[PDB]
Design a protein around this ligand. Sequence first.
Ligand SMILES: Nc1ncnc2c1ncn2[C@@H]1O[C@H](COP(=O)(O)OP(=O)(O)O)[C@@H](O)[C@H]1O
Ligand SMILES: Nc1ncnc2c1ncn2[C@@H]1O[C@H](COP(=O)(O)OP(=O)(O)O)[C@@H](O)[C@H]1O
Ligand SMILES: Nc1ncnc2c1ncn2[C@@H]1O[C@H](COP(=O)(O)OP(=O)(O)O)[C@@H](O)[C@H]1O
Ligand SMILES: [Mg+2]
Ligand SMILES: [Mg+2]
Ligand SMILES: [Mg+2]
Ligand SMILES: [Mg+2]
Ligand SMILES: [Mg+2]
Lengths: 232, 526, 532, 98, 528
Amino acid sequence: ASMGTLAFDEYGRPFLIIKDQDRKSRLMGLEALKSHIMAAKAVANTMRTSLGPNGLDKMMVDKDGDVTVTNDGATILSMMDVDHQIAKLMVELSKSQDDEIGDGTTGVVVLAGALLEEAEQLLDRGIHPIRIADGYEQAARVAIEHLDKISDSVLVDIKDTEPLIQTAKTTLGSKVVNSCHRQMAEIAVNAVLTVADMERRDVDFELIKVEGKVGGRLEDTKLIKGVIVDKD
Amino acid sequence: RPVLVLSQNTKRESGRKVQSGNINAAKTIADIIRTCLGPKSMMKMLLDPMGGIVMTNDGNAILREIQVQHPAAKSMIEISRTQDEEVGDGTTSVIILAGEMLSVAEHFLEQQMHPTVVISAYRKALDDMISTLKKISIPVDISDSDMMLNIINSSITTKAISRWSSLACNIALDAVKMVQFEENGRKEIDIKKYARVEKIPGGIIEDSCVLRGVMINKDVTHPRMRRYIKNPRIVLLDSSLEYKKGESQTDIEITREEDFTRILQMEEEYIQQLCEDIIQLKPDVVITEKGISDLAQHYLMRANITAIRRVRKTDNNRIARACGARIVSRPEELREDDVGTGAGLLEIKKIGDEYFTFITDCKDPKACTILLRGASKEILSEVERNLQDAMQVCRNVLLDPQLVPGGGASEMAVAHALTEKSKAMTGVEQWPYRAVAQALEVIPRTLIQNCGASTIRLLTSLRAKHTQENCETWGVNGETGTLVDMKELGIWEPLAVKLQTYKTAVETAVLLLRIDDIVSGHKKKG
Amino acid sequence: PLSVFGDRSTGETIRSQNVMAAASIANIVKSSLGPVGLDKMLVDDIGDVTITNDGATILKLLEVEHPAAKVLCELADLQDKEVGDGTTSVVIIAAELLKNADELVKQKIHPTSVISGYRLACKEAVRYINENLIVNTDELGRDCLINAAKTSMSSKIIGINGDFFANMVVDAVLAIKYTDIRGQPRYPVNSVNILKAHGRSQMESMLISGYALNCVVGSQGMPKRIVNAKIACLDFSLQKTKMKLGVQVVITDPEKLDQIRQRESDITKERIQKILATGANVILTTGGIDDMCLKYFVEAGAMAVRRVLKRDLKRIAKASGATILSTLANLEGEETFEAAMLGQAEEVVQERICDDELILIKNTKARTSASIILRGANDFMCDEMERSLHDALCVVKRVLESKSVVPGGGAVEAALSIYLENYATSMGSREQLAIAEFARSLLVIPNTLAVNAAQDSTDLVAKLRAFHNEAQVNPERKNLKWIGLDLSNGKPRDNKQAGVFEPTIVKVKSLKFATEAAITILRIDDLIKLHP
Amino acid sequence: GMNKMVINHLEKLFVTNDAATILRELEVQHPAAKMIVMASHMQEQEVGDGTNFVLVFAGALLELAEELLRIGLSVSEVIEGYEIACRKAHEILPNLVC
Amino acid sequence: MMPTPVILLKEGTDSSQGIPQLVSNISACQVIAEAVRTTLGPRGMDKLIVDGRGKATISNDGATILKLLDVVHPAAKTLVDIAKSQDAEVGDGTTSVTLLAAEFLKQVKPYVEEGLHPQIIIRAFRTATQLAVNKIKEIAVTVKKADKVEQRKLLEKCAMTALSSKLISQQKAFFAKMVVDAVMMLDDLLQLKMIGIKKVQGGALEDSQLVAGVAFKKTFSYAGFEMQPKKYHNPKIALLNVELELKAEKDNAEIRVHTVEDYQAIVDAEWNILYDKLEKIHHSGAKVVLSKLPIGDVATQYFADRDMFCAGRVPEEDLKRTMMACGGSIQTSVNALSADVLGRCQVFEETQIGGERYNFFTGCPKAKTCTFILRGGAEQFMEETERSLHDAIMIVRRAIKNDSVVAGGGAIEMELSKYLRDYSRTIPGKQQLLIGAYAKALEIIPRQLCDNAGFDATNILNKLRARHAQGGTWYGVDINNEDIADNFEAFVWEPAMVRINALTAASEAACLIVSVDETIKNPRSTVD
Ligand SMILES: Nc1ncnc2c1ncn2[C@@H]1O[C@H](COP(=O)(O)OP(=O)(O)O)[C@@H](O)[C@H]1O
Ligand SMILES: Nc1ncnc2c1ncn2[C@@H]1O[C@H](COP(=O)(O)OP(=O)(O)O)[C@@H](O)[C@H]1O
Ligand SMILES: Nc1ncnc2c1ncn2[C@@H]1O[C@H](COP(=O)(O)OP(=O)(O)O)[C@@H](O)[C@H]1O
Ligand SMILES: [Mg+2]
Ligand SMILES: [Mg+2]
Ligand SMILES: [Mg+2]
Ligand SMILES: [Mg+2]
Ligand SMILES: [Mg+2]
């Protein structure tokens, strides 16, 4: 069940097929799926405590001893030193969510963990995993259609930023800057609205410079309609 | 953690490789001693792992001193030992014959012939070999001592003792003749037990003789006893002549002051009673396999009796056979018939720096000793081996009075007979038949090679001679390398030796041809 | 998850591993089957050499660490113990059954169906053998026993010499026949002593019309030949008498010490005289004899043998009519030996066999015994000759006990394969496939026989199958059931006419045992191997 | 003939029944076998086919030479006989052209 | 054996010959086939292989799995080689070739164990394979109408069948439509380098798009790039191979002056050379400037001042695709920038795609190239999507070459097995057994399909055999309904050349494996 196959032939003469076959490992069939589901469940259960306004940060320490206290799911999984391949798949999923959207990088991991956890008990009852995947795809289509149905539209005009401010506040609610919550949402909305092509076109993040400097207070963070240069 | 259906140290080899390896191993064993055959053979030096030196040209000794790893070589060694034990001669011949038959069998195995066919052909060949050997034999009058001496000579012309031919022949013949014994309607010779060979380094080989009695490396227990008795009456014993503890636990308890002295006096009285019982038969010599007490020695010297102690059981049996005595264990049951009368002289004399006891004038002795005097221990060991071969040949002739021409004449005659017989089979096994028949030519070929003459010319001439009608006794002269009639040269061999050699060689070839798998390395699992 | 300190294999992996192990064991001995089989040479890593063809011996000498291979090895051992022949065939059949059953399982056939099919096929094969493929030995006579012995000794070192060895085996077996209660003639093989001594060729092997002892007389003074022997068998040592553990000698008056010491040996002297006063000539004892009693026997001119093996002594006593006497004590409390307790023989000698000596008890009375002295070229040859001779003796015993024999040379397997292939179509839906695969597996024996001869195995087996199909289809061609394989010419041949017979019990027991082993191994689907 | 899988010292597969290729990919160490291989390669260079013939004929000649040496003939006589027979064979060969 | 004081071959040489080594070779082939056994069919499962460096490759492609496996068995390497051969010549069926070869060897293993001469087996395989290929060519369905709608539908169905075994099988209709469109708009040689495959992390599979033009990633813009307009409505594209930056005039050039006016003149001359190149580019009327060589900051600012767009260090393949789509010519010199050598596209735009910026050239009416932009959640996700799309593209190209289709799902092989059994029932009988074994081996694919789907393979095989015997050429395994169906009517279509090449390669591999009798393995050199 492990290490692959080992017979050394029925005639006693050596029977070697793959280089270093005695040093390699092999998992097959249902127990491989169970191991993968267990690893993904572990990752998702680790991440799920940092979900929502009452989420708790994770204190990440890299190989050099530098400390990164953070709540972002993609950052946490990126700095996590994993060796399991399914954990790497979880990390890549978080990175994908961060790149495409930028928010919800923790919800994807919890959702994937829940889906695999349910698929475990489905597999225990003798359902082919491809059937589970097909059912998941069907239900995902239904859920996406329902989201489109129950969705609501907001105005993205520059003369009324209240819905935009509310959305930014909701995004920031789970972060440590919730003390300066409204100011942070205000500056983020103004920054995006200032540098953007109004015909629903792209927003060039290269035109937004995020600069940090120690000292002062967190409330001193401000949006500057210009450039702050590190020179004199 | 490998699966390991078989053990890790188990190795398997199979196929043509196994057969080729077995046949090559047999050929190598043959080549070791190929040159040690014939009158012109050369001796070999064998270094004993214990530090000794064995210098010989006997085939069995050479093969016995060699350690080998290939199991086919072990089989060949066992074949040599079997031939030596069964008849005592023809060891080199049987080894060479087995090697040659295995070679000619490999010839067919290389082609698409199954080994069973070769084995069946070999067995048919062996049957015809036996038939022809019995056919070409001649009878022998065992009464004629000259013919027996000639046979022993022909046996020992190829050994280092051949320089002293008449002496060795007479020694062997006399020893066998006076060890021959018959009782209760059963006849026996028993060269192994009686007819002891005792070698004393020094002197000259011409002084070697077989005594009409036995000789042991023993001396009188007390110097006052006579060392030269004319017509002794010998009494043999096993039990010690000394006070001994009983079998059961026999603790004593002494409370009276005079019991200790009494007990010691009873010990002395017991010794005196045993000695008196022995003396009652009026003997002159007392031999014991165990100790003799000093007080017993005194009591025996009081009666003028020579006493020898701590004699080996084999030596004591030999003495009993020689002097017509019977070993007894309880002196109180000693009878007149047990007293050994028949020894005509007993003499203890010094040889070199050591005493030797001689009982050497027995009338009609059924046991004997052979006193070998020579240059050193190795020379005497080789002389003993040659004389053992001579005695074995003499015994074989005495049991079976058939003779067979030597010098390779019998080999060529049998080969020609089998070749002529093979012309009528017209089957598929005729070829192995003819091959194993012509494999017998390795004996005359080896004789010619050792002699140094041209092999091809002499074998061609010999085959042409044997193609005639009355030429079964034509062989190869071992010295001049010429074709001579063996009824003129006089070299003859016992039929038993030839039969045993042929049988053993053919059967070895059959046994080794039968194997095609080798597995090794497994545990003993005793 | 499990946290078991060991390795685990599950599913197709363990099944294929077991099949591989069984196939390796079968391939080890597959080359030593049939008349064109060849022996092997085993080296025991200390120089010991064993040359053999017997499957059981090869499998016992080999050290094996895979338990399925161990199952096959013990299968061979069981077949040897219960039958004595067919030890290689049962192993090969079991391995082929396992191979084909595993193929069926890999085809998603449930192993329970395969096991049920195998059970049905084995039952039907035994029934068909008993109903159609048996030949009674009543209408054949001694020729049947001779042919069975010759067939058994084929593929052995004594195969070519069957014309002589079969006569020897049959005479030895018939010489020990005894009838018990219920009037059942039973033949106690292993009562034939087999002695090995190198020397002359195989033709000089001797069949003793009596018993042969691997012992010599204890003293050179005793005679080595007695004409009218009166054998006395004893089970107690004849030595100086020593008191038991609970008895201790304590001396207060010294005058009694000499009497004590004298009586210590006078007791044994009196026992010897009591035994000898009845006219005894030969005395055999399992215990030892010291020099004093040896001289007592010497003076009387009587042969005395010590350290005789207990089984040899029992056989000698039974054959000669003597009685084992562990002690001399009658029911009157006295110590006596009566002449009625003595066996008799027509001659007892000490012959010389290749520089050694052994005692021959020739022509015992009140029962006939037998022993065989095997003469070979060396020790290995004699050992293999003994093994082959034992196989032949067991085969003759089976034939004489159960008077049914079956044609050899693969005839039974071919007939069974045809019959089972036809019969499977009337049973089940998947056990049908199992029975078909059982029938196909039964054909490994003729295939191996043909292959060992370097013959065209495919065409020869096809011709055999065609002959047996014609026999089973045409009611008037039933005489073709006996067509087997003639390996000398590589052609089908009427083996019953050719005299290639063998006991029915061999095939029946081999089939049953192979089915059991295949069912046992096929049941496994998971292996846990704890670390030592 | 049956193809042979030959793996040289560099894990380069050579499945072929060409005698010259098999010899080239075999690490022959014995000097006499080396000379036989060199003769085979010379035949391959000169003609292009017949290398296996070269090995078979040379091997048969050498085994029969060993037989002749064993029965008694000297090396020189065997060599002279082989040379004479080779000359006779070369003389005969043109007459066998079909 | 014996030590042989001077040994023939080098010490350590391993030799194996006879039946046992052939049986071992067959067993090794079985082991290799087992590695890709479960990857076959719509119910097939992927395999994950990790190299020594730690990178993980997740694939359903048989050739990829075999390549990632580091096989060193001499006989087992033949199956990897035939998988590569099938991938190269056809592009699909790399699992079928290995399964068929292993099944051939397994079927003939019992006969090999009986000592049957391998030449007979080889001849039987050759005869059976020739007959099977002829039958495939004979019964393959082709339509001699050259109807555009029918041809498009056939290509779409073949692409869907080639796609309904991979992780993108849920969007198989979508991706089949894309692949068919791309191959049809390829011009005449169907060069694979003319179909760009861009993988961008993030986004659903349905977010993947096919560009009717060319698209490539942003290439290391310099300062002043963000001032260039990022959308044009009818740009003219200048495809250049020119380094537009101040630099040494030549590597071995060396300037010698002895006067300050000459120094200033040399400096102004370098500047004037650069500005002359830039003015020549600008006066051509082009608005988008693409170069294979670096474009400096000075040139970037110069183009920004003119409302122009520049992008240096464009990969060569991307410039070739841009040339084939917009329709210009790559110029190593700017001295003759005429309207002939200028590309033209309807719309150029730079847009963000999942944290990356891409340049889009759309609206090309006579484009001979495409650009697949694939979205997904992981690097291996996009890699396997690309592999599946490559399989589909190769199938569509081959179907473009010849529209000869055979129904899949094991129907073609069941028909071939029936035909071969019928043929074998009418020959002497030594070859009959081997041809029957070949026909039985041709049943591995439907059996493997049923086994992977979790069916009962025996019942489906019996039903298929009965159906083919009583009539019906295109009845195969119906995975969804756990039954059999007319797979031709279910649009389970396969180009005939796929099965033809599969049978040819499997037969050749089996013949080569059987033909070998001895394996010789020389000792390693420089083990280090
Ligand atoms: N004078 C002789 N001339 C020729 N041949 C002889 C002579 N004496 C002995 N032989 C041959 O030499 C052989 C004896 O060789 P030997 O060394 O005794 O070998 P082994 O010890 O094995 O018998 C015999 O076969 C015999 O025929
Ligand atoms: N003379 C013969 N001709 C053909 N077949 C034979 C002959 N003698 C024996 N056989 C067959 O050879 C098979 C193998 O026997 P063998 O392997 O020697 O016995 P075991 O199985 O006890 O080792 C037996 O099944 C027998 O039927
Ligand atoms: N819809 C389908 N229904 C049944 N079988 C299918 C279907 N689509 C593909 N197949 C089968 O899948 C087999 C090939 O498996 P796949 O993994 O797609 O390609 P490859 O042969 O390259 O592994 C083909 O023999 C085909 O018959
Ligand atoms: Mg959030
Ligand atoms: Mg001699
Ligand atoms: Mg048997
Ligand atoms: Mg050629
Ligand atoms: Mg495919």
